[PDB]
Amino acid sequence: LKRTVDNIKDPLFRFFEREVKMGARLLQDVRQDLADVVQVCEGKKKQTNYLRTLINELVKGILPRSWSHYTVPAGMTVIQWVSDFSERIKQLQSVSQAAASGGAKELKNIHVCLGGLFVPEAYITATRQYVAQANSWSLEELCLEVIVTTSQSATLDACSFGVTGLKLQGATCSNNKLSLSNAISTVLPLTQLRWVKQTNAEKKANVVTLPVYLNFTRADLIFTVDFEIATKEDPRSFYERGVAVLCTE
Amino acid sequence: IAKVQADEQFSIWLDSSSPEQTVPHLWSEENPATPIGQAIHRLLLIQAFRPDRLLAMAHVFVSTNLGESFMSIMEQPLDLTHIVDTEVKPNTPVLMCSVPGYDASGHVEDLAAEQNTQITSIAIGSAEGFNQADKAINTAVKSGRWVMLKNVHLAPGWLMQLEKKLHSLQPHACFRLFLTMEINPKVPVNLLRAGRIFVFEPPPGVKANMLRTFSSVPVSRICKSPNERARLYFLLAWFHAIIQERLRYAPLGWSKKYEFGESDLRSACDTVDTWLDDTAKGRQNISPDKIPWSALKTLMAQSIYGGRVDNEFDQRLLNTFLERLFTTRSFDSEFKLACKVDGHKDIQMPDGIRREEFVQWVELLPDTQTPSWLGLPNNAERVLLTTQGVDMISKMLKMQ
Amino acid sequence: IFTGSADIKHLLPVETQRFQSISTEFLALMKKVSKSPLVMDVLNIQGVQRSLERLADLLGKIQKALGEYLERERSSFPRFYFVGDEDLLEIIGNSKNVAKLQKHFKKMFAGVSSIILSEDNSVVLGISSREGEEVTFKTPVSITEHPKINEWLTLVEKEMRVTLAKLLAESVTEVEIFGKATSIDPNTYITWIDKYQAQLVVLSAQIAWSENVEAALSSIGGSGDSAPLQSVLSNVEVTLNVLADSVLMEQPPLRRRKLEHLITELVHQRDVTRSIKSKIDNAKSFEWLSQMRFYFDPKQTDVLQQLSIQMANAKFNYGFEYLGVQDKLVQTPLTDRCYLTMTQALEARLGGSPFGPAGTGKTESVKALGHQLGRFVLVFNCDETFDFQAMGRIFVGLCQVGAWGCFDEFNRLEERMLSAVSQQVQCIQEALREHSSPNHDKASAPITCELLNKQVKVSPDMAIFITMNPGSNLPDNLKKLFRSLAMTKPDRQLIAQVMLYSQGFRTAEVLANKIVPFFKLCDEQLSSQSHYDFGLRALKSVLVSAGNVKRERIQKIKREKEERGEAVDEGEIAENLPEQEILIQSVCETMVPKLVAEDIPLLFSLLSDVFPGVQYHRGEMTALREELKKVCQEMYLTYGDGEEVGGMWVEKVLQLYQITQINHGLMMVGPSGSGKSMAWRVLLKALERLEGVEGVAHIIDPKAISKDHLYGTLDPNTREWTDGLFTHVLRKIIDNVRGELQKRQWIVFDGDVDPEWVENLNSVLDDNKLLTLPNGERLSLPPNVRIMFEVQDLKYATLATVSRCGMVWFSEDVLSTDMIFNNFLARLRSIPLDEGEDEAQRRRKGKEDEGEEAASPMLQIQRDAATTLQPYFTPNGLVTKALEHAFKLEHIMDLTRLRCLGSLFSMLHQACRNVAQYNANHPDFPMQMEQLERYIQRYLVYAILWSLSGDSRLKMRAELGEYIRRITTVPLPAAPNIPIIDYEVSISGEWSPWQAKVPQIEVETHKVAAPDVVVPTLDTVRHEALLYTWLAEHKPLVLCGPPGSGKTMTLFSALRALPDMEVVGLNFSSATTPELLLKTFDHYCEYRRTPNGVVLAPVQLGKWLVLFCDEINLPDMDKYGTQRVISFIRQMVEHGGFYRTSDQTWVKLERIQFVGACNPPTDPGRKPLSHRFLRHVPVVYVDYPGPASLTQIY
């Protein structure tokens, strides 16, 4: 990303710049390692110790430790990693195009897949500050209101940001209302993160707090979402059944 | 694609409980495939359609290749008699590795009891323990006696020295050295390589966990006045099972695999004893309202079991379990230990007020446990299965 | 042992007599051996083997008898297990000199730092804390009646406990009046607080609150009305209001700390009482039982059983250990859970293991719980500085005295130490578990553990805590003996709220909810920097500083109103006062000096995000500002205010001044050439002129000399002590031979910081302000002395050193290129080049140098030169744009701005010197400005090309020449296909090809390829001109290039061509150290004691010594990446001298130069030179001669 005077002022721009910085570094590293593997398998490169262990891990499917400079699910194979890496770098290219041409403000209107980002919690922090700066509000008086919209590309308010790829585990979000589900996981269409001024309203008994875990391993917590309980369902059922939100599945 | 769309029973098969036993013919080939060819084609179809059943289908593939009774020995209980007497040489140690928290020394204790062979059991970990161990090893090698060395994972270097000593030593034909461990990476590779290894895992399930719990807790301890004490233990036992079995279904059950084990159970039993003794003050019976439910719930949620829990959502889950189980309502005749079990019918807490009644209720539990017993959805098992299936394939890649 | 203290002989008379007899025999034997030192002769001594065996037997017996005596003394006074054998021998041996025992009380006791003796020092009147708080014994302990150290020391400990118990009883009796009241008088409350010790004050208030709530709950149960609990809450709120009113006022530091502790206590008490909400009506309800409750029973005869502290099931007794004035912790829900879990583990006889990320308050919570129970807690830091050999002795001490032991991070121990300490902890914890065994006789309970191969009795009151940091788990033997607790997320919001409330802030909650997320933002949005610290400790320090700022604003307003006729009201001043502005001011004053240039806009952006509309206004310092402006004018530096040129540098020097005011040790960690040295020198001179206090600086490069030569060393054979450089400087100031104290002494280091030479400085930089020597002397840091580090980076610096020192980061944006251009032009217009010693002191003697404008023809010539150079040296001047292009070009060395700028300035100096020599050679026709202008413009272009592209290859030199041709209007040579760098600027403005100056020499038949014959070629004459230019100014010129290019021969030939020049070849290698340069100076130079000082000058008068160092790159770096000889050369070329390792005196160089040659740093075995060294050296890339030069030579 091309940093300019106005660009560095935007928290979203700074986040995306850090993301693409890390993405490019890993992209070239992995590509150079794969090129060395191709050269060895073609017969024109000698197997060094690092090359030998890398080839052994790729043949056995063990994820190389030199790779995965960001947070990844534990025990995941090399194929799952390269597929996810390709998707993440494609998202980074699309974000790069929007930032370079679409302008800085387009970064507000673009829908970001939290799974693709290396540090989505930094994205949530950026969004909060953005809202605070635009509305001249203090940062700590902002609380996150989540509205899942099934309408494609639903209108984005000034403080409403689009996020895709969210997966709801063991629940179905209908009309922004959760209902216990026996399905393995239900993909949330377009989750809208709205940063609203914090009120003194008492959390209703029909409100449940769900963790938004980074991946299916539930090892990294990104943030929490307050959802409404549909029908006569106890929140203790949501707690026991392990209902949660995953940035990536 | 064409076969999938054209088939009418494909949908019900995809929604079947055991699709691996009724996999439809969805492949095209010039000549009829041999039984192993049909087995591998079904294996591919199951992997594509119903990965959770892959393991089951993998066992079918092994059966269609190595016979229907290839694995059947493993489900049978281990018979250490012949193995230790013959398969094992006198100079080959019998390594008995359990999962952390499990014990395997009782197996060889009973083996020596039935074999009428004198065995000396020695707990390793202290220098006096080391001296007792090596002197008893010398006595047994010169006299053909059995040696037990418990928890030898605590002394890795001493294990290396023991392996070196055994390599040169020439034992008597009846000498048998058993070393019990809890499966640690600290165990030397040379000791594992130069010794027969037996891996012991507890039988999974709420019923087995509660049976192990009741057995460990002294009968006299659960029999002490007031008579309500036993019921408390039952709840505690149930709670322990409900969490430990839930640990199998991580990360859906618990966000991470905590070390809920015997130490927490002993601490909770001690807490129950102390607080119930303080409340009763010698009375033979106390009202269910008088029991310090708040004290027990708080100490188990923040101190006994909640100490290991660092996630706030795992702590919330633990608090919900404790608030559901440890109440006065648990002393009613209609208290429901687990609701919506299997989608119909729910577990009822036993009406008895004696330890033997609770153990009888545990022993008559149906052998149809589902994650609904633990509060989890019944599909959780499927998730576990599919994970294991993927895991198997990953392991099969590492053997390439 | 027997020649260290005279009283040791009195303690062990038999052993002393025995050793004297053995020593006689051994010395006779050693004299016999010294007569005939041959091994065969020694082996042939009659009965030598039997004599040595007898000596070994007897010596072993005495050593054992001594060990048994030490063990008996330790057993009599168990706290002696906390001091080593040497310390214990000092304690018992120095019985008469009681004042030597005061240095060991900190190890034995918790808060007892000293004991207060009588006038005759024969009666222990009482004890004292490190802060200064004292506790007078009800019945003083008499040393004369109990001469044995063990006896009277045990009596001191017992009287400590008894006094504390009685004073607590009195304090509780007094504070029950305040508890049972509706309006606490502030004066009476402050009097009570002043009367009693801080721990006793807090404990008495806790006891009073617990008694009131206990009585209330019982009353509520019978009455059925929550009135009693409401009254308790009201009383707590009234006392909190009184405490707030007191803490706004001006209080002594001890009373201020007591007030803060009381506020932290009462906030928690009010929170617990409010938690009235849950409608508790019984004293046995777990909502009350789970709270730590204090039941004081003064009628108990045993002091250790007078106060009971009960939490849930657990019930302990107050140990009544004097803790001094400790740091009370905000009782957050996480700390409440920690207290509950650890008390439950202690009651269950299990140890505690709080685990989590570093900085979550684990060991602090353990220590706070130990101090709440009146226990002595020892925290064992499990880092590399861990006393493994003393662990068993300390464990025995903990078992015997009933003290607590906390391990800071038990997983940081290596495998062997981890296993051994785990075994010891396991045996002690099994012994503790034995105490929960009913079968064991309670009446007679000698529970013992196997420690130090002996049966050590374990007191039931001791405990072991094992703090861990996952990412890991407890050792397998300790897993079943310890209760783990996840302390992973401290409640920073409540901590900040309570601390801000204790500092007088009325909007404590809002400010906390603002400052915690702000610190999270900075910790996650500022450049990853090692010196950055946004943790809980830094947040607490920021809050304390904000309280200080609030109080200083209040005092300023009060003083202003007192000067006027307006009435004074502290509460009114506090009310009409912005707390958010004070918080932002404290945050800025603490964090901005540590920020890099990129993070300041970020910091202010995040700040505005959290604090909207609140602006930070830097304090105005007009007096220091005008002094700084005068000094900068005197030193030709550029000054500016705010956004003006030099504004960033001036704000940096102001920040450095404020850091000097706050801390005694501090660091400048800007990159090379960022104005650090000029900043602190200008500040020193400005302070000199402003305050009137003389300023003296001691620049001590810590790597040009060894650690032994820096801190001194003592000979183990003869016990002869030598003062090191830093120790000599510190002792000189402490001696005050010439009233050193009356002068501001700054000890600047100006060298790389590593964890090897700062270990002895850690105690100096700490709050101790003390230097401990291997001799044993304890040198106290004087108040005027300021230890200052001027470094480039902190890659190899410990976090301890960084934390102990203030931080001022001098980013390269502080120093602007315009500022350096202005400095160069001012120096050129002011300082005459030809004048040396003369007109150098005349600059200082003349405030404005009136009447000395035409000092010399040199000065007029260079003033005219500065006029012609002025247009080019503008913000967008040719020089700037060329410098940007130079950065774009690739170079053989790591490019720095100041290396190129210094090379350019020296070339311009040589240009004006050439004008001078032309004027001298033609008196009749002075160089008219017309020709002078043309010549200077052309030479400016020449110097730009040779300074910016000197490192570059010929292609990049051509690229820079083409860029200059495109961006300039000066007439460049019109050669179609010849580079501009191939032309010389003659005396006239016209260019002339270098090939014209190349002669056609003829070599004789022999010596055809001699290693001293140099055929003059274009490259040779061009480089020789560059050498003459940069050696007229005595710069450390370096030629770099591929091997075989001709660096060594051209350098040697040009140096030998100069008549008054002694060339010394010093071939460097990886084994090269500064002692090579010292040997060279000893061989070729002499030291003379001039009145100014020691001067090192060549023995041959009227000659300059040049040290041709052939391979600058080769000297190997340390494991912290530093070439010591390169740092030595850098010191000798920057500061113009060094320090003798024998006299510890400054030696100024005279008539000594340095010249270097190198191969490219990318070559194997060559290390890149430091930027602080490359700043002074002009580097030239000596490439291969090329077809024409090769054709001519061969």
Ligand SMILES: Nc1ncnc2c1ncn2[C@@H]1O[C@H](COP(=O)(O)OP(=O)(O)NP(=O)(O)O)[C@@H](O)[C@H]1O
């Ligand atoms: N102008 C010249 N006149 C005569 N001989 C030259 C000249 N330039 C290079 N040479 C020859 O080139 C070689 C240079 O030797 P030397 O001066 O030791 O090179 P260097 O730059 O010091 N290389 P190294 O020290 O190995 O990195 C010798 O063999 C010289 O004879």
Ligand SMILES: Nc1ncnc2c1ncn2[C@@H]1O[C@H](COP(=O)(O)OP(=O)(O)OP(=O)(O)O)[C@@H](O)[C@H]1O
């Ligand atoms: N305020 C100023 N105005 C003009 N020029 C300045 C100013 N401060 C410094 N300079 C110039 O910049 C040069 C570098 O400054 P200084 O010697 O203080 O650097 P330093 O940070 O100590 O660097 P090093 O790491 O090389 O020791 C000075 O020699 C001087 O020429």
Ligand SMILES: Nc1ncnc2c1ncn2[C@@H]1O[C@H](COP(=O)(O)OP(=O)(O)O)[C@@H](O)[C@H]1O
């Ligand atoms: N309840 C509290 N009140 C005040 N300060 C606290 C509290 N808890 C933690 N802290 C601060 O947090 C820091 C943590 O330091 P420490 O506990 O020594 O390291 P660790 O947390 O790694 O054990 C301490 O400086 C302490 O001042």
Ligand SMILES: [Mg+2]
């Ligand atoms: Mg720490």
Ligand SMILES: [Mg+2]
């Ligand atoms: Mg400097």
Ligand SMILES: [Mg+2]
């Ligand atoms: Mg050379």
